[PDB]
Amino acid sequence: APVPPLIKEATYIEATASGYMAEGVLNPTIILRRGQRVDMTLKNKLTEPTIVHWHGFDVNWHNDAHPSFAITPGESYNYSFDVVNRAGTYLYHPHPHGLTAKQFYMGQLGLVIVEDSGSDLGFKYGVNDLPLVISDRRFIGGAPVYNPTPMEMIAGFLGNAVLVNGVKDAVFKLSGGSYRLRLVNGSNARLYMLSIVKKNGDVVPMRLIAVDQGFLARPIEVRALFLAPAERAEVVVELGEGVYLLKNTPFDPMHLEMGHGMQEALPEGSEYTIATFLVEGKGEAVPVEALSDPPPEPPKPTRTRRFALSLSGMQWTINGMFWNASNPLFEHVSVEGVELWEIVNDKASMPHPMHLHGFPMWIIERKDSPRQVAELAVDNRGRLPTDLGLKDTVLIWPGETVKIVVNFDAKKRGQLFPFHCHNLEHEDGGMMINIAVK
Ligand SMILES: [Cu+2]
Ligand SMILES: [Cu+2]
């Protein structure tokens, strides 16, 4: 069961080409307590600028940290803030404009686990509480390469092999029993439709217990789940003796941005094995029923804002806007109070996992979703099981409209927070804008 080692005291971290180094260990999982103080210094050991982003964290833009605060090689940057996020699985990764995709892909990506009273639900990290960070790489000669062509910058860079926690053909030797699996899409662009199945047997139901920003009100059994870049989904499964497989099952990738898609070595919608679970012996049963940290009801919006996701020529845009490299402080959108955002993805487009920094989002409704998505919805608002928890990254399919509500807390007025697609090629391509809180 190869998973990232834990790091209790993350006071110092170095950004290296192979990933974050702290205490001699690469990309360790930073575990924190809701309410505790974080204080750590980032040192840039790269040959280019960089900055760490605490994905999904409620912090000020200085501790976000905003792309404009990126540091040069040799410099350091200090983060100091109180952890006010709910128990959940978050991430820490690079955010320098134009260089994020490569740094991320070459190795810079770690997990941030926030714990609170009773959040471990009886599971032990590294034993039966397993984070599965799924990523893909394009191997040439057995080594990963990141050489996106202009067309791949438009569509997203897809690898020809999928890894779990940095391991190719990932295999887990487990004992029979209950397992909490923290599914994390750590890929640059690849979308997954995840299912757990008994080898040459049936699909194993997964009980979804948490997403990006924490626990759901109650567990929700699902058979498959879409997981786009940066989305997180924690599920509980009961494994008996035998062989189980974490797989990608068939779906329509909907690459309609430039005709109908390009030739791929490992088709996004093809069936393939992500990880193998060799379950042998009798292990511990961990009863899960009550999740004691429900998500709050969404607030009442006083203003509706429409967002159009479109490809303008060779430039991905949001309401026609895109990042201004010459002015990283440009205020694309001025917001205040509680707003309802209607995010509409063009038909001649591709799925985009939109992510908002600094403020979590409540998913209100999905409309005009493709059938493969509509069939998975569990309420009359077209919402998916993952849409039922508080989120920070949501997938919007071509032709689909996803409505979300966000509380732009007045406490953060005067600060800038990025709103962008988490497909890293799109992000580096400029599909990111600043949200200015007023
Ligand atoms: Cu973020
Ligand atoms: Cu995108």
CATH-scheme architecture of the largest domain: Sandwich
Could you tell me the strand content as a percent range? over 45%
Output the number of helix runs: 4
Q: How large, in whole angstroms, is the Cα Rg?
A: 20 Å
Topology-level CATH name of the largest domain: Immunoglobulin-like
Give the CA-based shape. Answer: globular
Quote the distance from N terminus to C terminus: 47 Å
Structural class: mainly beta
What's the CATH C level of the largest domain? Mainly Beta
The molecules bound to the chains, other than polymers, are: copper (II) ion
Protein name: Multicopper oxidase
Binding site for Cu(2+) 3: 95, 357, 420
Binding site for Cu(2+) 2: 55, 93, 422
Domain Plastocyanin-like: 23-117, 301-437
Write the layout of secondary structure elements.
Layout: E1 6-7, E2 12-16, E3 19-22, E4 25-26, E5 29-33, E6 37-44, E7 52-55, E8 76-82, E9 88-94, H1 100-105, E10 110-115, E11 129-140, E12 143-145, H2 150-155, E13 161-164, E14 167-168, E15 171-185, E16 192-198, E17 203-204, E18 206-211, E19 214-222, E20 225-227, E21 232-239, E22 242-248, E23 272-282, E24 303-312, E25 315-318, E26 333-335, E27 337-345, E28 352-356, E29 362-367, H3 371-374, E30 393-396, E31 401-408, E32 416-421, H4 424-428, E33 432-437
Parallel strand pairs: 1-5, 2-6, 5-10, 11-15, 15-23, 24-27, 26-33
Antiparallel strand pairs: 2-3, 3-4, 6-8, 7-9, 9-10, 11-12, 11-13, 13-14, 15-21, 16-17, 16-20, 16-22, 18-19, 18-21, 22-23, 24-25, 27-31, 28-30, 28-32, 29-31, 32-33
The structure holds copper (II) ion (2 copies).
Residues 352, 421, 423, 426, 431 line the site of one copper (II) ion (CU).
